Amino acid sequence: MKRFFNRFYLDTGIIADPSQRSLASRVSAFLVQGAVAFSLLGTIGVDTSPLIAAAGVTGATIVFACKDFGTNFVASIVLSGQQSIRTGNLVCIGTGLNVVKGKVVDWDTRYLYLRSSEGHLLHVPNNMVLNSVVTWE
């Protein structure tokens, strides 16, 4: 099942990093196996309501705690392929006082790297990039 999940993630391009892809495949396989085991246990007569409630509460806690990380990952997934964000392109992010200017040097799944005029490295989150005005020369 891990191989199937890895192939699915690689084909759809959701995850490109081999380590992250392997970790996500393992997590998904474990979750599916646990769901199948819980269904089988509930079929024969075992009351699975407390287990379902505990699993749901734990999952909700994990999801709500990692909201920023998930949003940044989804923003990186969506922003992939954008023509304005390319290596060597001078872009400006934000409007007003909260403005960021630099040249794109490297792209990551959590941060967007820009090089300022003075040479400083700017780490702009993909979430900030999605919901902001992007100015490209």
Is 81 one of the binding residues for a copy of itself (CB under 8 A)?
Answer: no
117 binds a copy of itself (CB under 8 A): no
C-alpha to C-alpha distance for 73 and 24, rounded to whole angstroms: 13
Instruction: State yes or no: residue 27 binds a copy of itself (CB under 8 A).
Output: no
Indicate whether 88 belongs to the interface with a copy of itself (CB under 8 A): no
136 binds a copy of itself (CB under 8 A): yes
The 3-state DSSP class for residue 60 equals: helix
Measured from the CB atom, the residue of 18 and 59 that comes closer to a copy of itself is 59
Q: Is 29 in the site for a copy of itself (CB under 8 A)?
A: no
Task: Name the residue with tokens 């990186």.
Answer: 76
CB of 102 to a copy of itself, least distance (A): 10
62 three-state secondary structure: helix
Question: Could you tell me the CA-to-CA distances from 111 to 49, 75, 107 in Å, in that order?
Answer: 41, 10, 7
Q: Which residues bind a copy of itself (CB under 8 A)?
A: 31-32, 35-36, 38-39, 42-43, 45-57, 59-61, 63-71, 73-75, 78, 84, 92, 94-100, 110-111, 116, 119-125, 127-128, 130-137
